[PDB]
Design a protein around this ligand. Structure first.
Ligand SMILES: C[C@H]1c2cccc(O)c2C(=O)C2=C(O)[C@]3(O)C(=O)C(C(N)=O)=C(O)[C@@H](N(C)C)[C@@H]3[C@@H](O)[C@@H]21
Ligand SMILES: [Cl-]
Ligand SMILES: [Cl-]
Ligand SMILES: [Cl-]
Ligand SMILES: [Cl-]
Ligand SMILES: [Cl-]
Ligand SMILES: [Cl-]
Ligand SMILES: [Cl-]
Ligand SMILES: [Cl-]
Ligand SMILES: [Cl-]
Ligand SMILES: [Cl-]
Ligand SMILES: [Mg+2]
Lengths: 207, 197
């Protein structure tokens, strides 16, 4: 079939949902596109190049709240960006692991520049602006990776017998498995934003 | 060599530092222990069983702050536990990746129960206590994973100055700053009770 960049990325993302990141190979991608391996090689050098392109493409296509709206608060921007980032990572099987090996992308640098500009215009030092954006990224990626890797582990092993669990852990596992982590994620996200605001408003005061 | 659980884990952790998690295989572990693969199989069924055990044993060996001190505040306990957890994950190559997706083991049940109970004794519902602990875990894992990926790997104006600041250390500054933000947010939520906040 067609081997323009867009068609190859489309095929590879479909293959990722079929196999997961560990099972995704250039050999399987060639099969899916109906070509020989040295044909594919002209388009796609190796698995690493393929993953770098998927990582960038997943955010380009599906992370559509990367920029603040006109007049938006920095609180609302971090909340909206975090929810978008999390949705984008959950959209594909092992998506967060695909992201975790992104390369530098010039277009992602212009976006982070706009986000750091926005934070500093709203009163953040460059340091505190970067720390806030980083913490939101770290928290969000950590929450998604724990959801996706736990799913991936239920593919291989089981989950331990319920009847030796102490009571609060039993109830905690009931709560953490009652959704895809969304309630926990949204609650932690409010805690993180409010922490940042207490720090911003403190200026040089002991806090 | 010797294939008691402890010797196998010792060998697998040494191998992890050599290869990383993707490169860690039962075949390479058999080589390191000087045995054939079907000997290893008697002791270690597969990579998933090995990774599950390493996640547990890394914390048993190196996570020294899993329980509150006598009289400690929940704020100080979360801070101390998060710093310990991060140090434990940084001790081995791809340590965070080893942890991801695991759930508490039966050997950890008493510890993690005491952590949950401790939060409830300090005014949190089990749910809100779990939400706090989970946020700390997710933030710490994310921060370590980004530091371990930068190791594995190794501009606009504000970003350039930000990269100077980020790479003047390992990640510890950004980590500890975010951790204070998360703790303070949990406190603002706890102290609000049923007030709009
Ligand atoms: C309560 C645990 C839990 C409950 C429900 C689902 C889960 O996935 C977990 C965990 O995975 C926890 C950990 O891994 C700990 O790191 C964990 O296992 C642990 C420990 N063994 O001392 C910690 O220190 C905890 N943390 C870093 C402060 C944390 C546990 O609190 C949770
Ligand atoms: Cl073509
Ligand atoms: Cl194209
Ligand atoms: Cl689609
Ligand atoms: Cl491949
Ligand atoms: Cl707003
Ligand atoms: Cl032996
Ligand atoms: Cl032993
Ligand atoms: Cl293997
Ligand atoms: Cl204290
Ligand atoms: Cl109890
Ligand atoms: Mg865990």
């Amino acid at each position: 079939s067609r081997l323009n960049r867009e068609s190859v990325i489309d095929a590879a993302l479909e293959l990722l949902n079929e196999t997961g990141i560990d099972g995704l190979t250039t050999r399987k991608l060639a099969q899916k596109l109906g070509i020989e391996q040295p044909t594919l090689y002209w388009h796609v050098k190796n698995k690493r190049a393929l993953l770098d392109a998927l990582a960038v493409e997943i955010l380009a296509r599906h992370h559509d709240y990367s920029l603040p709206a006109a007049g938006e608060s920095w609180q609302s921007f971090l909340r909206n960006a975090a929810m978008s980032f999390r949705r984008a990572l959950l959209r594909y099987r092992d998506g967060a692991k695909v992201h975790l090996g992104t390369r530098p992308d010039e277009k992602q640098y212009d976006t982070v520049e706009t986000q750091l500009r926005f934070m500093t215009e709203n009163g953040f030092s460059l340091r505190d602006g970067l720390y806030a954006i980083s913490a939101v990224s770290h928290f969000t990626l950590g929450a998604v990776l724990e959801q996706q890797e736990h799913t991936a582990a239920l593919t291989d092993r089981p989950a331990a017998p319920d009847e030796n669990l102490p009571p609060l852990l039993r109830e905690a596992l009931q709560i953490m498995d009652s959704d895809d982590g969304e309630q926990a994620f949204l609650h932690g996200l409010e805690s993180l934003i409010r922490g940042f605001e207490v720090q911003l408003t403190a200026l040089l005061q002991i806090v």
